């Protein structure tokens, strides 16, 4: 069945209920917690061009939702609004009882389009999508989440928004853009820290290199910098 852990003299053991560990007494339901842990801990890459290869679309499978009771503080939280090319939404809207993931350093708000061949968005490595005290296995539209998994236990006795754009989302040929405003932006490259981008919008709002027209604006970056 579903495995389970136990704390004993500050040492984590598999809670063997198959061979009962009678020495560890379970006295109250307060002694049970259900904790969620982020994939930032394991060391997976966190930038968006490394992220959206782990995601993918599928139809014909129902979604599921399980709750937990505490989670890690996170360093990266994501958000999506992806439209099908005929103008409809790829992602289903969030049913009620869903709030965003509540403690986040940065929010990688990502919009744009893609082919969207399927109904839902699943995680290719079978991880969860951590919402507010509710791990799910799909992505709801417009609700800020984080990635990670859930461990079970037996116990002893603010943010900052970064906006992107994307074209051809999901495939291996998806292009990525920054956003300064709704007309001015700059193409992304892999060697870019987000602090570089923070200096970039501050530089652009200082030097005024924005849209003074009605069209869209795509900078690139100095290839030797």
């Amino acid at each position, epitope marked *: 069945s579903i495995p389970l852990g136990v704390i004993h003299n500050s040492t984590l053991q598999v809670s063997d209920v198959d061979k009962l560990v009678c020495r560890d007494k379970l006295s109250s339901t307060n002694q049970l917690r259900s904790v969620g842990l982020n994939l930032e801990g394991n060391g997976v890459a966190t930038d968006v061009p490394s992220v959206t290869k782990r995601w993918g679309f599928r139809s014909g499978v129902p979604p599921k939702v399980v709750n937990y009771e505490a989670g890690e503080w996170a360093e990266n939280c994501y958000n999506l609004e992806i439209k099908k*090319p005929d103008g409809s939404e790829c992602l289903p809207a969030a049913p009620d009882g869903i709030r965003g993931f509540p403690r986040c350093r940065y929010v990688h708000k990502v919009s744009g389009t893609g082919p969207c061949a399927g109904d839902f968005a699943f995680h290719k490595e079978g991880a969860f999508f951590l919402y507010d005290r509710l791990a799910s296995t799909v992505i709801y539209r417009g609700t800020t989440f984080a990635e990670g998994v859930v461990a079970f236990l037996i116990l002893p006795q603010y943010s900052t928004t970064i906006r992107y754009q994307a074209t051809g989302f999901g495939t291996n040929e998806t292009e990525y853009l920054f956003e300064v405003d709704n007309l001015t932006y700059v193409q992304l490259e892999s060697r870019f820290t987000p602090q570089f981008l923070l200096q970039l919008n501050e530089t652009i709002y200082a030097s005024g290199k924005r849209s003074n027209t*009605t069209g869209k604006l795509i900078w690139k970056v100095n290839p030797e910098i």
Partner: antibody
Amino acid sequence: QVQVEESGGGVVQPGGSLRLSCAASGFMFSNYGMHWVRQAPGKGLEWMAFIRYDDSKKFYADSVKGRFTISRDNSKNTLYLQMNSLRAEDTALYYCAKELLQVYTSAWGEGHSYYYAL
Amino acid sequence: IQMTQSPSSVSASVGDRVTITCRASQDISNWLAWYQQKPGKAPELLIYTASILQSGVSSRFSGSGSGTDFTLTISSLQPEDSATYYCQQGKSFPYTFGQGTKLEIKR
């Protein structure tokens, strides 16, 4: 000064091949992306295809996927269109067109493109 | 992507007021360019991004729109305005065009 001119027409057998040559003069040809459209001989105008200026995308209409091929040579300053496996509906009027585009560089050591239109 | 010019063919005298509305099957919200093809000529760009007039073209050509509902407006007709009028998709590739409204000028 801004010179866009078609060349390479004629009559080709069905299933045949032809390369068009749209020459360029008067602008930064290696900075602007180019287009092809198609007007039916007695009917309205429709779009065909384009290429981005950096040569990163060769995007085509639904009619000619697996039929036509865009190349471009920024050395010769000449837009190319290779046609292959021609069909009777392709008897038509062909335009090559420049896109509406302005380039600014004044922020740091990298330029830009003001994407509008053709 | 589907675009439809309405109405299809307008005939009016010199100095009259021509309004042609283009429609879109989905949202593009300003991404359209206005063309004018005098017959035998090339389509001359009139208004790009649905509200900004091309240089070299007089201010008699106006019109705007939002969402999927874009309009050209000619404030006063000229005898050189006998032309087929065009729309251009602007946002998503593939492009598509309006079907062509052949404006006739009564001269």
